[PDB]
Design a protein around this ligand. Structure first.
Ligand SMILES: O=C(O)c1cnn(Cc2ccccc2)c1
Ligand SMILES: O=C(O)c1cnn(Cc2ccccc2)c1
Ligand SMILES: O=C(O)c1cnn(Cc2ccccc2)c1
Ligand SMILES: O=C(O)c1cnn(Cc2ccccc2)c1
Ligand SMILES: O=C(O)c1cnn(Cc2ccccc2)c1
Ligand SMILES: O=C(O)c1cnn(Cc2ccccc2)c1
Ligand SMILES: O=C(O)c1cnn(Cc2ccccc2)c1
Lengths: 402, 728, 402
């Protein structure tokens, strides 16, 4: 019934893992800063109309525990009636928060909702929350748990992606991120992080290496950090993918997503809510879909979710102007492009997480806001946003410029 | 449950003695056997003793747990555990809960409890000792300590998992103690903390136990009788699962376990790891009850019954002479003469020497028979440096063997074992020049793998004493001997080879003369099914994965490279001629075409240097890339479980044929012969036990096996049709 | 747009905190047991039509980390396309999961959803996840953080509820829970927990004290375990509520909700999804609402949330047959009853969390399933379900029997 519109979409710059500028900043402060930016852009908005704040967060412990969405409501001085709920759907948590917000608006029982995500991976590392799929032996053994990087190496092995193929995509991601920054494509949506005194902490994506060359990417060593360096996971993967004899380990730190800190916020509402508060809609949520694929390969969820959201919207690949898929690993994007025959010039046109980083809970909201801006900048019509997820899940969203 | 009792009660097992100092000695002495065993009698006996320890608590100062047998305590009641049905899960759970309540009460009595370990403490025996506060072991020869429940498909359910994890942490307890059931000598047991102190003789045990109690009461009054995990401030070695250091590596424990088992369907190691980690997350009593539930699921499952059937009942029916002829006395063996230098002839000489027999190694020349004795020589050149030198015994072993190159040195031989090239004319000859120089009662044994024993017998005058004695390389490590009756082989000759097999510490099976015997014939169907799938276009990697995940020690294409494909071609040609000679016709197996395609490509196995795998510097290094183009790999993609079942069912059906044709006379020989002879997966309990223990979508039992075999027959061929003997 | 129907609603019994029967049960197993029970009741249901599994969980840590909803999908052998997302909105997480499921169905973008919650408080105690409001002294100092118990005592002080008043409600809750169990009201919705061998672990709510007396409740001491026992929280509360001189500490362990372990599951779908699977609808979700109130008193959120859902559904208090409010504290229920003039015979008619326990993330779905059964048993029509929440939030839902 009610249509869901995007009125604002902003994000912080992404701070890097080691000696990063955002390490001293509580993840709660990253969200409050974006709330203050929304207030700056609409100082007469009646925040009592905002009925919920929905934040994705993959490691909701420590600084990110205790429903950080409600903490952001209280700490920012928003009305006590504004709710606040944390959710976790691994890498797609940020987009799931936006989709849940859009569905609350469509249901007619909510009018104006804040949605996004926050992840301070330098302060709350991945896995800090534990979990059963990894730590409980009986179920770990049964589901054949394998780290993401090994599934991505398996994809490259099965599809025939060489080390040079994944490094070529990584170079292209670095170049398009540098061109987008230098061209001013991100000037309106990246909100610099500042301290309690107004001093600048960070105003750009620290993880980027614009001078990346193909020769530098070739010198990098295959991934060996954390769980993957531990033994057995190659054999577990090949016990299920039994027709593959040996896994070609092509992924490194240079063609995999960066570990970064960041947050993102999206304001979603009905037409009546926007008319009432004098808000101009930037885009419309056309359709959403959740699906999945094999959790041992773990990164092939994007393809069924993308087909499902195209079918639900009555669209085909040719009707989409921009495709935005999170760059968790280079082979995941190359597989996605190969399966759906995505033209090269439509895919991740402003660079991706390989160059700028993948702040787990916030990434989905970040790349959605990226597409809202690039549609408006190109005067293009439709964009499709999707992410691969741990556990073999997939989430996809289609937006239409307004 | 809240009692130390579970249910003409059984007879008492424990004797009670309270000395003048208040120290109670519990001596375990089951009058119904030579070994204390965790049976109904023990449970009722320990229940009474523990009830009394609590009732008389005000006059008791300490407890010593001892044994009057040669061993301390070893094993459970397998007769009972093998009968436990899934509907008996509650009774199994209540039993181990009762056992652990007794041990827990003993452990929390408020006074020190010492275990006086005089001999072997295995399984439930070590679990009793772990419930004590101090362990003293006598460093006597033959004593072992460990928890080998996993080797029967069970787990240490009387507290062994919970207590060793509390003592050593998750990683050390699982890797070194629980997952493989490792047995430790008393010296090594003290080093790793399983035992606290050692004494030289068993007579020092109880005095040393009462002395330690006296000193513990004087020097540690507040901590006397308090286990480390019952004190405030207990820290688990290596941390708990919620500890950040252990949480980082914990997700890799199941994957490394899958890597070691190669995906085989053995449920016990998975359950041990689950009980260990889950138990480390909660208090001791809760951890103990979790352990009981995983124990009950193993006992009431089928795999544990397979392994109990094979490694307990079947192996002891064989060692008790089930296949040995009845009413035949023993006959001494004075000299043994081997007719051949080589990997077989040399290994036979060593295993005969170590048993206490003099051996004469004959060959075509003494410079070649010296190379034969060089094999046992290098075997002793290894045993010496590993701290396992029998010194004069080893030199006497090598001195027992005596190369020669002439028949004159076989003078006093009354037991001949030939190991020469497979050629009747050669064999018929090499027995002729030796038949008259040996003793009049000598046994003429042949280690052939193809030629018929009845046909080889015609080359000697005493055909009643000609018999097949089939060894497996390496002879020093392979524990099976396949004894083959010729048509004219006498029962006396069979009984004497049977006794010789036991004397050299190996396991005999008795096979009647038939093409392929039992081991070579059954393992052929395993290899041929794999080669068939390769010729059908199945991915070579999937075939090897199916072999490993089925539980075989070597995947079948790797095994084909080591059996040599040319030798497989010869067995095919010989099987042809013989079938054709007797008027029959030979339906060729599809594997023969795969064998021929590899030979004409110059890829015939590991010795050739190129087979299904590539070989560099002798070691195996990946499948041959040209394999997929040669056989159109990928054109056929059956489910992995179909490939697994095709290999297991082919061997199980060929085993049932052998039993129906009288090639074998007992399923015990079939099971042990398949497990120990050709490497049939131990979780099945043997190629014959696999039929009554099959479990899958169709259910569990012989009827489920029949249904699955018919399902395989429709999809892949009538060689999977079940025989009449398996049908109702 | 599309209507959202409840097709199934089950729960585990609630095991107690000290020496409880469920202490040995992984919270993942609690959820899997309920999934298996749904399979027994509908063996022919095509599980590929289930597009998401939404679980509330307030302490998503350790045994409850790593998106337990996805773990439940994989461990139970559900299709890998079935998603799985964890969310946290404190005490309303279980009801919020049901509401999000309903709103997903109403948006037309999901068809059949499992929703519920899980909390093993004996294994993962409250606060194990940390919290951005108790570990950020700057935030704590500004929001004037106060434990829920002091807010409940403050409600008793402001409203004139005596120790005997709140103890009289606690007695009433024990009685009605005992009558409900004796009358067989719960026989078909409480699913006994069993081990891997089929052996019974728990089949009743072992926190109940059916022989509670008024004299026994009078002997209990005011609550003085946890954060409240520490200093300062009375003074912080009265710095805001400055017209109150002294707080009357009336709440004990006998008139507050119990600490328990439990899980609950609800199957929610559209009418088309039900028809296609041969499912019988049991109730219709009429409306939902999310509001809040002051976070220092922290427990008066249910009052505007109930008015908001009544106004949205175009209904009044007279139209509701059964009111179900979570009994976090006795005074919270007494204020709700006084503020809205709720008849006694309509309020928490089968007892509540004082008698049976409050397993945080699952409670919202438990009392929802309780009202579905009691509406069917009474042949009544409308029930309203609401819960107070830490941080001053409120959630409410109206259902109609079908
Ligand atoms: O820990 C061990 O190895 C063990 C072996 N047997 N038992 C006692 C037992 C006997 C029959 C049925 C259930 C349990 C414990
Ligand atoms: O294999 C060996 O010789 C060995 C010696 N120490 N460890 C570590 C260990 C510690 C505690 C309990 C078991 C093992 C293994
Ligand atoms: O990843 C590690 O750090 C590691 C250390 N030891 N292991 C071997 C092991 C296998 C199975 C169960 C427990 C331990 C793995
Ligand atoms: O049954 C076997 O073959 C087997 C082999 N290893 N284990 C246990 C183990 C696991 C990981 C690391 C060390 C030991 C059991
Ligand atoms: O005999 C039994 O009780 C049994 C139970 N499960 N399985 C198969 C299995 C083996 C290893 C790991 C997972 C499953 C056999
Ligand atoms: O095709 C057959 O009939 C067949 C029988 N055994 N094999 C394999 C084998 C090779 C060398 C020695 C022993 C066995 C193949
Ligand atoms: O209630 C307690 O447990 C407690 C402990 N220390 N204090 C005093 C304190 C005040 C301000 C900052 C730090 C400490 C109170």
């Amino acid at each position: 019934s009610e249509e869901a519109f995007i009125y604002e979409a902003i994000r912080t710059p992404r701070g890097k893992q080691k000696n990063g500028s955002l390490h001293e900043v509580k993840p709660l402060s990253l969200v409050v800063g974006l709330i203050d930016e929304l207030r700056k852009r609409h100082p007469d908005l009646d925040e009592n109309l905002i009925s919920d704040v929905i934040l994705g967060c993959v490691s909701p412990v420590g600084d990110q525990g205790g429903d950080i969405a409600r903490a952001a409501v209280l700490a920012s001085g928003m009305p006590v009636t504004s709710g606040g709920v944390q959710l976790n759907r691994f890498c797609a948590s940020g987009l799931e928060a936006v989709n849940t917000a859009a569905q609350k608006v469509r249901s007619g029982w909510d009018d104006l909702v804040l949605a996004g995500g926050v992840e301070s991976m330098s302060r709350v590392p991945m896995g800090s929350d534990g979990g059963a799929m990894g730590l409980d032996p009986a179920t770990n053994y049964d589901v054949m748990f394998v780290p993401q990087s090994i599934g991505a190496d398996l994809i490259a092995t099965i599809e025939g992606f060489s080390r040079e193929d994944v490094d070529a995509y990584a170079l292209r991601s670095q170049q398009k991120a540098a061109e987008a920054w230098s061209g001013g494509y991100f000037a309106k949506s990246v909100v610099p992080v500042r301290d309690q005194n107004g001093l600048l902490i960070l105003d750009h994506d620290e993880h980027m290496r614009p001078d990346t060359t193909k020769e530098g990417l070739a010198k990098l060593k295959p991934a060996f950090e954390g769980l993957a360096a531990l033994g057995g996971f190659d054999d577990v993967a090949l016990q299920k993918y039994h027709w593959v004899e040996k896994i070609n380990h092509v992924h490194t730190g240079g063609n995999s997503s960066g570990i970064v800190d960041g947050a993102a916020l999206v304001m979603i509402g009905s037409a009546a809510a926007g008319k009432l508060q004098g808000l101009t809609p930037r885009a419309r949520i056309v359709a959403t879909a959740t699906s999945g694929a094999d959790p041992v390969i773990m990164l092939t969820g994007p393809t069924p979710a993308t087909r499902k959201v195209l079918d639900r919207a009555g669209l085909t690949v040719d009707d989409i102007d921009l495709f935005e898929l999170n760059e968790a690993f280079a082979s995941v994007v190359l597989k996605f492009q190969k399966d759906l025959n995505i033209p090269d010039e439509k895919l991740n046109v402003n660079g991706g997480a390989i160059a700028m980083g993948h702040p787990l809970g916030a990434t989905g909201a970040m790349i959605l806001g990226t597409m809202v801006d690039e549609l408006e900048r190109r005067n293009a019509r439709r964009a499709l946003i999707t992410l691969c997820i741990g556990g073999g899940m997939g989430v996809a969203t289609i937006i239409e410029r307004v | 449950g809240s009692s130390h009792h579970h249910h003409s009660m059984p007879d008492n097992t424990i004797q009670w003695d309270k000395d003048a100092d208040g120290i109670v000695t519990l001596t375990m002495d089951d009058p119904s056997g030579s070994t204390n065993v965790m049976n109904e009698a023990y449970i009722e006996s320990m229940g009474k003793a523990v009830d009394r320890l609590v009732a008389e608590k005000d006059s008791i100062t300490g407890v010593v747990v001892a044994s009057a047998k040669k061993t301390f305590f070893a094993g459970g009641d397998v007769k009972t555990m093998i009968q436990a049905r899934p509907e008996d899960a509650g009774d199994v759970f209540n039993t181990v809960e009762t056992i652990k309540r007794q041990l827990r009460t003993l452990e929390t009595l408020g006074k020190p409890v010492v275990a006086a370990i005089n001999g072997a403490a295995l399984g439930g025996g070590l679990e009793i000792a772990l419930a004590c506060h101090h362990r003293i072991a006598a460093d006597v020869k033959g004593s072992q300590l460990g928890l080998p429940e996993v080797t029967l498909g069970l787990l240490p359910g009387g507290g062994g998992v919970t207590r060793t994890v509390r003592m050593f942490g998750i990683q050390n307890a699982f890797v070194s103690v629980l997952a493989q059931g490792t047995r430790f000598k008393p010296a090594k047991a003290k080093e790793i903390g399983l035992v606290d102190e050692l004494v030289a003789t068993v007579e020092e045990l109880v005095p040393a136990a009462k002395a330690w109690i006296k000193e513990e009461l004087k020097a540690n009054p507040d901590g006397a009788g308090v286990q480390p995990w019952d004190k405030k401030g207990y820290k688990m070695p290596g941390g708990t699962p919620s500890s950040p250091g252990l949480a980082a590596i914990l997700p890799s424990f199941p994957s490394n376990l899958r890597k070691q088992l190669k995906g085989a369907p053995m449920p016990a190691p998975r359950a041990i790891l689950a009980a260990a980690v889950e138990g480390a997350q909660v208090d001791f009593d809760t951890a103990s009850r979790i352990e009981s539930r995983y124990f009950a699921s193993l006992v009431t499952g089928q795999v544990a019954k397979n392994m109990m059937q094979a490694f307990f009942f079947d192996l002891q029916a064989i060692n008790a002479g089930g296949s040995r002829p009845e009413g035949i006395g023993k006959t001494p063996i004075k000299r043994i003469g081997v007719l051949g230098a080589g990997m077989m002839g040399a290994g036979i000489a060593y295993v005969s020497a170590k048993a206490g027999y003099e051996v004469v190694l004959k060959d075509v020349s003494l410079e070649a028979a010296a190379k034969g004795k060089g094999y046992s020589e290098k075997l002793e050149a290894k045993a010496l440096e590993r701290g396992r030198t029998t010194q004069e015994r080893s030199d006497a072993l090598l001195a027992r063997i005596t190369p020669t190159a002439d028949a004159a040195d076989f003078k006093g031989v009354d037991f001949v074992i030939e190991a020469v090239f497979e050629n009747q004319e050669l064999k018929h000859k090499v027995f002729g020049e030796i038949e008259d120089i040996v003793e009049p009662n000598a046994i003429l044994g042949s280690n052939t793998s193809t030629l018929p024993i009845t046909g080889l017998a015609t080359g000697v005058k005493r055909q009643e004493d000609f018999i097949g004695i089939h060894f497996f390389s390496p002879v020093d490590k392979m524990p099976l001997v396949e004894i083959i009756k010729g048509e004219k082989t006498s029962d006396e000759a069979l009984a004497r080879v049977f006794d010789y097999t036991l004397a050299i510490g190996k396991t005999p099976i008795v096979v009647n003369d038939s093409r392929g015997f039992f081991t070579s014939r059954v393992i052929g169907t395993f290899v041929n099914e794999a080669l068939a799938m390769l010729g059908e276009g199945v991915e070579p990697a999937s075939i090897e994965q199916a072999g490993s995940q089925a539980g075989y020690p070597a995947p079948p294409l790797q095994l084909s490279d080591e059996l040599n494909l040319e030798l497989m071609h010869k067995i095919a040609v010989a099987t042809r001629k013989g079938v054709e000679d007797a008027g029959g016709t030979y339906q060729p197996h599809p594997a023969e075409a795969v064998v021929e395609k590899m030979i004409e490509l110059g890829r015939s196995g590991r010795l050739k240097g190129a087979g299904f795998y590539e070989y560099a510097d002798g070691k195996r290094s990946g499948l041959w890339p040209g394999l997929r183009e040669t056989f159109k790999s990928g054109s056929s993609q059956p489910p992995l479980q179909d490939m697994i079942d095709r290999m297991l069912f082919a061997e199980a059906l060929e085993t049932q044929k052998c039993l129906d044709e009288g090639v074998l006379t007992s399923t015990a020989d079939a099971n042990i012969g398949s497990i120990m002879g050709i490497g049939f997966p131990p979780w099945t309990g043997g190629s014959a036990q696999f039929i009554v223990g099959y479990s899958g979508p169709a259910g569990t039992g012989k009827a489920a096996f029949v249904a699955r075999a018919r399902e395989l027959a429709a999809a892949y061929g009538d060689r999977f049709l079940p025989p009449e003997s398996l049908l109702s």
